[PDB]
Amino acid sequence: VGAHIALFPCAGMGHLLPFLRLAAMLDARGCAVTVITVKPTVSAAESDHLSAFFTIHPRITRLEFQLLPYQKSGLRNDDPFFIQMETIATSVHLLRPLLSSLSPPLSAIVSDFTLTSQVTDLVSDLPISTYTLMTSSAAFFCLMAYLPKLLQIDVANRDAIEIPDLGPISMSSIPPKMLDPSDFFSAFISSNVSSLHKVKGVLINTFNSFESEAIEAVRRNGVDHILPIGPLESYDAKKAHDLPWLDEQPPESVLFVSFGSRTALSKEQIRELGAALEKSGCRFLWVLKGGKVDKEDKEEEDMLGASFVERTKKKGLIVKGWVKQEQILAHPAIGGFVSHCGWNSVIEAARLGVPVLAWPQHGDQSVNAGVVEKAGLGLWVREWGWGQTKLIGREEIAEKMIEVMQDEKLRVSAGEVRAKAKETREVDGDSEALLQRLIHSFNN
Amino acid sequence: AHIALFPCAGMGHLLPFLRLAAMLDARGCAVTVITVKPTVSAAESDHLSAFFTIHPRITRLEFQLLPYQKSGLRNDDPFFIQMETIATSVHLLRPLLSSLSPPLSAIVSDFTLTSQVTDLVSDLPISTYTLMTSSAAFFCLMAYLPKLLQIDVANRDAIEIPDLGPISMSSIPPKMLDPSDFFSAFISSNVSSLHKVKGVLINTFNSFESEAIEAVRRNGVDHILPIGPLESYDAKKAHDLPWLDEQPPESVLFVSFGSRTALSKEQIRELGAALEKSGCRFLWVLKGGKVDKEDKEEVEDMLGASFVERTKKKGLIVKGWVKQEQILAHPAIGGFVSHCGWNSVIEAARLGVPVLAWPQHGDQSVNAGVVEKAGLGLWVREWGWGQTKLIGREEIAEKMIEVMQDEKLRVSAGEVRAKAKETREVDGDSEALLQRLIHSFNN
Amino acid sequence: VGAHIALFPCAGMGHLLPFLRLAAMLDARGCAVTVITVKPTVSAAESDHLSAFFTIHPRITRLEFQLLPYQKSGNDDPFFIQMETIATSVHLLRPLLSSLSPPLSAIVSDFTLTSQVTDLVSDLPISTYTLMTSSAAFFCLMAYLPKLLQIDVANRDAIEIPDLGPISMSSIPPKMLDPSDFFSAFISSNVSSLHKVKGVLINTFNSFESEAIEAVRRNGVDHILPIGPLESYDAKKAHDLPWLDEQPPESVLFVSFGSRTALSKEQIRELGAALEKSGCRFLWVLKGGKVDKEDKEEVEDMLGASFVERTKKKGLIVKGWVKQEQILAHPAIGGFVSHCGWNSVIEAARLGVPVLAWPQHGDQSVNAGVVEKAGLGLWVREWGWGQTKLIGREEIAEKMIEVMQDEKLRVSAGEVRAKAKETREVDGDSEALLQRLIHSFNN
Amino acid sequence: VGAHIALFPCAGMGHLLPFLRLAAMLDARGCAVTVITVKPTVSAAESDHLSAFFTIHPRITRLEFQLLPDDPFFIQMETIATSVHLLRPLLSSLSPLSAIVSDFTLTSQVTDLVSDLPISTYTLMTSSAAFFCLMAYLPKLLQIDVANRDAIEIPDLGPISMSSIPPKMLDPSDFFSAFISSNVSSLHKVKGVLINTFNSFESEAIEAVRRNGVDHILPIGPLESYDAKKAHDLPWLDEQPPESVLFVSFGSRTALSKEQIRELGAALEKSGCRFLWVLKGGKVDKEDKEEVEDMLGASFVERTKKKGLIVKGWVKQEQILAHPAIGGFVSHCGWNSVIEAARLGVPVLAWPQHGDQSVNAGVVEKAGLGLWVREWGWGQTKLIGREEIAEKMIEVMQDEKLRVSAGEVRAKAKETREVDGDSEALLQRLIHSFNN
Numbered sequence A: 001v002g003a004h005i006a007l008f009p010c011a012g013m014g015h016l017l018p019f020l021r022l023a024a025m026l027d028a029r030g031c032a033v034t035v036i037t038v039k040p041t042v043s044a045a046e047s048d049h050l051s052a053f054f055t056i057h058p059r060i061t062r063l064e065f066q067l068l069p070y071q072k073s074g075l076r077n078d079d080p081f082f083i084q085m086e087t088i089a090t091s092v093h094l095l096r097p098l099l100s101s102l103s104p105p106l107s108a109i110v111s112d113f114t115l116t117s118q119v120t121d122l123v124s125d126l127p128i129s130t131y132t133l134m135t136s137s138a139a140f141f142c143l144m145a146y147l148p149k150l151l152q153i154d155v156a157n158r159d160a161i162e163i164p165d166l167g168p169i170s171m172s173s174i175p176p177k178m179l180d181p182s183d184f185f186s187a188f189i190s191s192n193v194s195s196l197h198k199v200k201g202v203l204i205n206t207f208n209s210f211e212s213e214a215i216e217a218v219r220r221n222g223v224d225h226i227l228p229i230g231p232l233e234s235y236d237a238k239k240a241h242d243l244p245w246l247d248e249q250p251p252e253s254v255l256f257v258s259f260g261s262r263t264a265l266s267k268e269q270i271r272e273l274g275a276a277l278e279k280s281g282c283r284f285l286w287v288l289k290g291g292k293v294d295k296e297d298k299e300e301e302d303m304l305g306a307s308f309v310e311r312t313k314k315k316g317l318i319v320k321g322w323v324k325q326e327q328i329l330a331h332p333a334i335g336g337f338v339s340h341c342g343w344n345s346v347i348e349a350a351r352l353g354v355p356v357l358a359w360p361q362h363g364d365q366s367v368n369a370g371v372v373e374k375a376g377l378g379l380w381v382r383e384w385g386w387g388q389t390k391l392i393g394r395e396e397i398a399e400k401m402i403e404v405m406q407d408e409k410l411r412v413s414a415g416e417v418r419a420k421a422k423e424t425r426e427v428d429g430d431s432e433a434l435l436q437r438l439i440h441s442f443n444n
Numbered sequence B: 001a002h003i004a005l006f007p008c009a010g011m012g013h014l015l016p017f018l019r020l021a022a023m024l025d026a027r028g029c030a031v032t033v034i035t036v037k038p039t040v041s042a043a044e045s046d047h048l049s050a051f052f053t054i055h056p057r058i059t060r061l062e063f064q065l066l067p068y069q070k071s072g073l074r075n076d077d078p079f080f081i082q083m084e085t086i087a088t089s090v091h092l093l094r095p096l097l098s099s100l101s102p103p104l105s106a107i108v109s110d111f112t113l114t115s116q117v118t119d120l121v122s123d124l125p126i127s128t129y130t131l132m133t134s135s136a137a138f139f140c141l142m143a144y145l146p147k148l149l150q151i152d153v154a155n156r157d158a159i160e161i162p163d164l165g166p167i168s169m170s171s172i173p174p175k176m177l178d179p180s181d182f183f184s185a186f187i188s189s190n191v192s193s194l195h196k197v198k199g200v201l202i203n204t205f206n207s208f209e210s211e212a213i214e215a216v217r218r219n220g221v222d223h224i225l226p227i228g229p230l231e232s233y234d235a236k237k238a239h240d241l242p243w244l245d246e247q248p249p250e251s252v253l254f255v256s257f258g259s260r261t262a263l264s265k266e267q268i269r270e271l272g273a274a275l276e277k278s279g280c281r282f283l284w285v286l287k288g289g290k291v292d293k294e295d296k297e298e299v300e301d302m303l304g305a306s307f308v309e310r311t312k313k314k315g316l317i318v319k320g321w322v323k324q325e326q327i328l329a330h331p332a333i334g335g336f337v338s339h340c341g342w343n344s345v346i347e348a349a350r351l352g353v354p355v356l357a358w359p360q361h362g363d364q365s366v367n368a369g370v371v372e373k374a375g376l377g378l379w380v381r382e383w384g385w386g387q388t389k390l391i392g393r394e395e396i397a398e399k400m401i402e403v404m405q406d407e408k409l410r411v412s413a414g415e416v417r418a419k420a421k422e423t424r425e426v427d428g429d430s431e432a433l434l435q436r437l438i439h440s441f442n443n
Numbered sequence C: 001v002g003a004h005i006a007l008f009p010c011a012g013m014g015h016l017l018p019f020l021r022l023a024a025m026l027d028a029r030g031c032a033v034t035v036i037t038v039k040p041t042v043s044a045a046e047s048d049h050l051s052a053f054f055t056i057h058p059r060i061t062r063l064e065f066q067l068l069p070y071q072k073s074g075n076d077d078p079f080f081i082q083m084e085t086i087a088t089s090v091h092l093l094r095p096l097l098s099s100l101s102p103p104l105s106a107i108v109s110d111f112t113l114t115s116q117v118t119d120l121v122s123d124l125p126i127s128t129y130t131l132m133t134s135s136a137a138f139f140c141l142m143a144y145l146p147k148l149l150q151i152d153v154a155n156r157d158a159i160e161i162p163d164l165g166p167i168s169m170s171s172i173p174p175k176m177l178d179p180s181d182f183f184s185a186f187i188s189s190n191v192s193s194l195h196k197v198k199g200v201l202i203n204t205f206n207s208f209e210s211e212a213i214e215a216v217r218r219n220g221v222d223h224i225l226p227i228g229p230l231e232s233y234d235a236k237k238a239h240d241l242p243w244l245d246e247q248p249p250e251s252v253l254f255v256s257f258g259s260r261t262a263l264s265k266e267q268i269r270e271l272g273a274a275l276e277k278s279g280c281r282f283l284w285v286l287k288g289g290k291v292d293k294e295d296k297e298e299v300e301d302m303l304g305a306s307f308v309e310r311t312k313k314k315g316l317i318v319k320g321w322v323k324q325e326q327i328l329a330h331p332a333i334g335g336f337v338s339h340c341g342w343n344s345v346i347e348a349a350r351l352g353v354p355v356l357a358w359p360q361h362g363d364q365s366v367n368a369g370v371v372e373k374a375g376l377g378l379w380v381r382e383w384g385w386g387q388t389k390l391i392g393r394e395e396i397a398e399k400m401i402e403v404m405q406d407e408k409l410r411v412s413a414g415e416v417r418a419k420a421k422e423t424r425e426v427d428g429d430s431e432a433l434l435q436r437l438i439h440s441f442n443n
Numbered sequence D: 001v002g003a004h005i006a007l008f009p010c011a012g013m014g015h016l017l018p019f020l021r022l023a024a025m026l027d028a029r030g031c032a033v034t035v036i037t038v039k040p041t042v043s044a045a046e047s048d049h050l051s052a053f054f055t056i057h058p059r060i061t062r063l064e065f066q067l068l069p070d071d072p073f074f075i076q077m078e079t080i081a082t083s084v085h086l087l088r089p090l091l092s093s094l095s096p097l098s099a100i101v102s103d104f105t106l107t108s109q110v111t112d113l114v115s116d117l118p119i120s121t122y123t124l125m126t127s128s129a130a131f132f133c134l135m136a137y138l139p140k141l142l143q144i145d146v147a148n149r150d151a152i153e154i155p156d157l158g159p160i161s162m163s164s165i166p167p168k169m170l171d172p173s174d175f176f177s178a179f180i181s182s183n184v185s186s187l188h189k190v191k192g193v194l195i196n197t198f199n200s201f202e203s204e205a206i207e208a209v210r211r212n213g214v215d216h217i218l219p220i221g222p223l224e225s226y227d228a229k230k231a232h233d234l235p236w237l238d239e240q241p242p243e244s245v246l247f248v249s250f251g252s253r254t255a256l257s258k259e260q261i262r263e264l265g266a267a268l269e270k271s272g273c274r275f276l277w278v279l280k281g282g283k284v285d286k287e288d289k290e291e292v293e294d295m296l297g298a299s300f301v302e303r304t305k306k307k308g309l310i311v312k313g314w315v316k317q318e319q320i321l322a323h324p325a326i327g328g329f330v331s332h333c334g335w336n337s338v339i340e341a342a343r344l345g346v347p348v349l350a351w352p353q354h355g356d357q358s359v360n361a362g363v364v365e366k367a368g369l370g371l372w373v374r375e376w377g378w379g380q381t382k383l384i385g386r387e388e389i390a391e392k393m394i395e396v397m398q399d400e401k402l403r404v405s406a407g408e409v410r411a412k413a414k415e416t417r418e419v420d421g422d423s424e425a426l427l428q429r430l431i432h433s434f435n436n
């Protein structure tokens, strides 16, 4: 553990967990690692996860930063993660005192994409080689990467968007917010992509077989230094879960439902899947988030209904809250996965080879579904659209759930992805060799 | 894009730059604000500290200016004297600006520092912009000063500025016409170097000064950009609000004469006599000591105990810094008395307060004219120059009464208030221009 | 870039734009360029254009001449009074020219003031040149007007200039044929001052006007140099064609009537009706204000709601200024409707865009004649001087449909574009002269 | 107390002490007084006096000018001129002055200053009416004669001999002439002039200045002491009988050589006068002076230890002179001191070392205030015998007429000091003139 490295996730479970994963991974490869967190955390969950991680890994060290107050309405409405990410920039300078005192000077720092522009000054005064880890799809990341020239190019939204060395992305996959220049979200991505130039390398949670077209497209696309790190290894946070029912079930019989760290859909729609879930007869494990964005704000299982919970009393079990998704997904009993297609959830399923039913709700998740379908890892119906854009059928959903359980071709293809994913983590694997090579390059 | 703001001395110069800087930061530019020490007035120093603690990501660049060194520019004013001191030392900042870790894309300089600042970034890759504290109408007079000085052989009536109504000779300040005085030398020296500036920022909206903004555009300053009204950085802890809450809406008349303007000893007693005689409710900010806040160490021994007792029911007299923008927003204030320094004037317009115009020194008279033109307030030209003139209680009181009860003004003033709102809106020109400007900054 | 060159355009977009292009051309070819402008500019557009030029082309310096008060009577034209107010202050170029660092090796002056700078080129011996913005056939008529207006001054079917196709009197403006009008005096006097010039550049080439170049060479202008077509300057933008991107190639008709408004409102509406009948997809740039950018405040009141809605999915209208050269260059544009201002005509040939000719005033009719001879466009003679006649929509529609479907025209038009390039290419005849002129200039 | 006023002395206690008294006097008369001082101060004493003054008068404000980079006192007077502009900020921030009273030496520099920040200005002269005219008539005199004559005449003033006149002042080349001549020219700007004199002391002198174009001269003499109270010092003063003690002070700077000083020290014991002697080591600098009383010799101290006391350093002169014990004064005759003697009615012996003082000695003689020997002359020029001195020294103790003449002079001084008298009247009037 001669080399000293830090990783600095900003906000959100999707951002936070992987970086921890990168750190544990880095520690495993003889790196000395500090993990930087900024408080107060947006969600109760983020700290809960963080606390365990440090307890679980003593060798890795916690490096908190306390946030200063801010009040800017320029950011549209009130979504806390952009606000949290924005606040982090306001207090980012507070970082400098913290880095100056590090015992063995940091060889490199790994920084979440959202604040790559603020850190840059910090990265010139203290000359730290700075790296980034991408939580999104390489195909989706390819879109952001080419966004600035594409945003400069036109004023209206066309039928299909062409990123230069990649298959054109349908506009339906793209978020509205991305398209309009005036909107801030556009501002945050554009500036940050520019800051990539300063960075020594860019790391993404995907592997070359997995996104062959995109990774190369990125290569000639102005993102030369991108390294396919993924799939990010398990956090090894053992353990906090009781699953007597899961053990009883036959291997690959049970269906797992998670819509991500945040809730994805309306109750009326939600009841529709529950009704369709009954029609399918799949044994299930369902994790439900009452609060669409914050764990702290949810004190609501009223939404599914009284009759349904008793009706599926022996068919399935549901958790209202947080459960270990990878711990559950590695179980022999789980054979199908219905996800919101956040890239971390999609990547974990590919690593464990669990067939996916893609049900993207917002953001980059629609683009990840296209990768899920292109990979052959999962089944996706593009026509479902964004959440609340259309109300998709109980009867319609049931046919798709029945296909995932009884389509053997998906199982053979899903099995291949697990083998493809495993091979890249083997000593001869490009992903393991790239991580090992990057660690070798870090200076004393 | 890194932008640096270089305000000169004075809360009139200081307040606008910080306000914009906060606006720039809100809209996402990396912002640095340049301050130098010492500062003439306590408020500027106290304010800067407050502003930075409220806005953490804005960098503070502090330089100690060289000791006052001079020859020429007859100056009897402390704030103007400090401006000369900042201007003579701006050329020593070239070494510091060259090595800044996040290099500046552009500098937004103060009008007074524009000539020295333009020379400073000549061989550096930094765009030079200037923010104008005053009104657009005054800028037309500034542009015409060389023509005004050359063909000004006769002391008669007013001079017709080329694209708008002629200004009375009484409105032009006598100091502006004397080349020896600092006010004239600085105005002339800066206008000559305005052509080396990428853009000139102004605190007026297109609705407020359509003729003045248009006249300057065709008069050689073709890069003018209206961004007004500037928005408050809304940072404040001390509350002096309580008396007002007791007051009925619109009853109170607010009197203030800016950061560094004081009345005559005969005028303070005649103004006080008028406030009693009028019978109006009022809020008085008393700045008897003079410009500097530190030396104005007196504490209401200007009027005496007898007067406070008589007026306590209808008035509160405060000596010290008051949160002007907040007071103006209050339901209670239905009148304002102003020296018509532009920043007060803009605030009156944004918050729709009827204004009673009372110039004491410099641009105030022209701005007073603008205020009258737009219906914002009533101006009495005959009163002429405060500090050169004395007005009796009878005259003052009647005007005070008249402004409070002009419903046409209250209706008229509101209309300006609406227009100021529109411009800030995304459609509205002033915000749009800044949004237009901000993109430009990215290079 | 050793050689020091200054070009002076007096007024009008048509005069201003070509001169800027010549300036850019000179700098690219190794001259060091000063550009002289006279303010206040008649129009907002020249100023808009000039500021962008200097910011885009920053190695070229800007020399400005502030104009003095003028008052002569006998309202003519705003660009003709500005052309005569620049000659009332043309002695103000003396101080400026004497101060210039690398002294001028040659100055290029607009033809309107060649008689007034004659004296200035003797005192400071500047080899002076002039660039003509009209056609080579219309300059021939301009260059023989003095000798034609000595004989019986009247009108015949055709008036003839020495060695070129006789020009009809229907193409010649009526004010050029009366010797007591302003026009003639300025043309006669400036053609007399062409003998003091070292060269006379025109915006054309010899394939386009073979007879005019020799007619002008064998009639008193032996030092005439055709350096056409003038190259394009930069501008940096393009949020003008979101619809242009969606439209298919060569399918869009571009309607421009020049820097200024042309036809009467009643006439325009028939074209608008005409456009509709044709089905041509179109991009239309409408200038409401017939002569002044500043004066035009009309909007949707030119064509009516009725038309704008119906063509809503098939055409777009831009009011004011558009980057005409960039638009024409676009793959989408397939036809050009022009007032046949010469500068516009040379770019259409340069860009190979087919023309429907609707000359409105002045030299435009002769230019229309040139367009016909070249094979560049379709022209109807009988349409006449603008507002002389009212042209029915049906007649307008037919020519337009004919333009869309006329294959020989495209082939001939395509052929013209190749030739224009041929001249521009380094071996090229027009290219050769400009390169040569610089070689002559002495440091 | 409405009016607000400021004083500015550049250097020497010759000017500062009077100015402060001017400052205190002005405060008494209802004036807001600000005293402007120059730093660093040339002398530790000069610095010493200022701290005491503000501390003693709480209500008098102090404003200071820090200074940017021959005689130290003269050169510094020159330095203040360099930094005069520094004054400009100070005036601008003032809580504005109804008038400023400024030192004669730097009046020329300030003229520009007064005109921009409109302030009526005055100067106060610490030298005699007879001497001021010599400065006052000097500029014409230098150009017109350019020669050396036994005596020189100022228009309405009895001519005083060259012997009195300082040599340097005579030379056109010298720095001193430029300062004096230039400043008088600047004298035109001031709305008043003040000298530490009263008409009675020099009716002839005051008139000539009035005659000679110094129409605005105002004599406000004698200036009231600004003083500390109360210190139990000089138990050696209270002990002695009235008028038994001779107090010797050659200046606010040293004036004579150790051997020349030894002759007076030997003369003092022969004279028999009881004495309190203020002995300064530094010829011109208090900080420079680091010598003990070894110029007089150990022997002198043992012999006279009961008879008299020697103070090395500074003492409060007005405080000492006012004492009953003092009956004789020996003075270098600096005017400020001479005026103090007249107001306190203490007989003087005049031994002027340098400068204006010899002329000052002449005034004392016309007055009858003290006994003077002209022949002794400029200090260190000649050696004056111990035997010769005592006879004059004894004569000062035992002359009845002198006591009478001196008694009147004190009486005359008071009358002007009182409300009816002109010096008081003008002060009242000038303040009245002062406009808020």
Ligand SMILES: O=c1ccn([C@@H]2O[C@H](COP(=O)(O)OP(=O)(O)O)[C@@H](O)[C@H]2O)c(=O)[nH]1
Pocket (backbone or CB within 6 Å): A012, A013, A014, A015, A017, A258, A259, A260, A261, A262, A287, A321, A322, A323, A324, A325, A326, A341, A342, A343, A344, A345, A346, A348
């Ligand atoms: O109950 C839950 C919900 C989510 N996750 C983890 O949350 C991470 C982030 O999910 P993703 O990136 O797919 O989407 P997000 O929640 O950020 O929208 C993934 O590692 C999931 O395994 C988990 O472990 N348990």
Ligand SMILES: O=c1ccn([C@@H]2O[C@H](COP(=O)(O)OP(=O)(O)O)[C@@H](O)[C@H]2O)c(=O)[nH]1
Pocket (backbone or CB within 6 Å): B010, B011, B012, B013, B015, B256, B257, B258, B259, B260, B261, B285, B320, B321, B322, B323, B324, B325, B339, B340, B341, B342, B343, B344, B345, B347
């Ligand atoms: O007691 C005061 C006096 C002034 N101001 C602020 O100072 C600003 C500038 O004053 P202005 O430019 O109107 O006058 P000036 O001080 O420049 O003469 C105004 O917006 C006021 O809000 C204040 O907050 N409290």
Ligand SMILES: O=c1ccn([C@@H]2O[C@H](COP(=O)(O)OP(=O)(O)O)[C@@H](O)[C@H]2O)c(=O)[nH]1
Pocket (backbone or CB within 6 Å): C012, C013, C014, C015, C017, C256, C257, C258, C259, C260, C285, C320, C321, C322, C323, C324, C325, C340, C341, C342, C343, C344, C345, C347
């Ligand atoms: O909307 C316009 C109109 C004109 N032009 C250009 O400006 C010049 C004006 O055209 P021209 O002089 O031929 O016509 P006129 O000036 O006589 O009306 C031409 O070079 C055009 O290329 C342009 O860029 N945009």
Ligand SMILES: O=c1ccn([C@@H]2O[C@H](COP(=O)(O)OP(=O)(O)O)[C@@H](O)[C@H]2O)c(=O)[nH]1
Pocket (backbone or CB within 6 Å): D012, D013, D014, D015, D017, D018, D126, D249, D250, D251, D252, D253, D278, D313, D314, D315, D316, D317, D318, D333, D334, D335, D336, D337, D338, D340
């Ligand atoms: O030991 C001393 C010597 C002098 N003085 C004061 O010195 C002042 C001015 O002295 P003067 O100008 O007469 O002499 P100079 O300064 O020119 O030597 C008088 O007010 C004295 O009271 C004093 O207080 N103590």
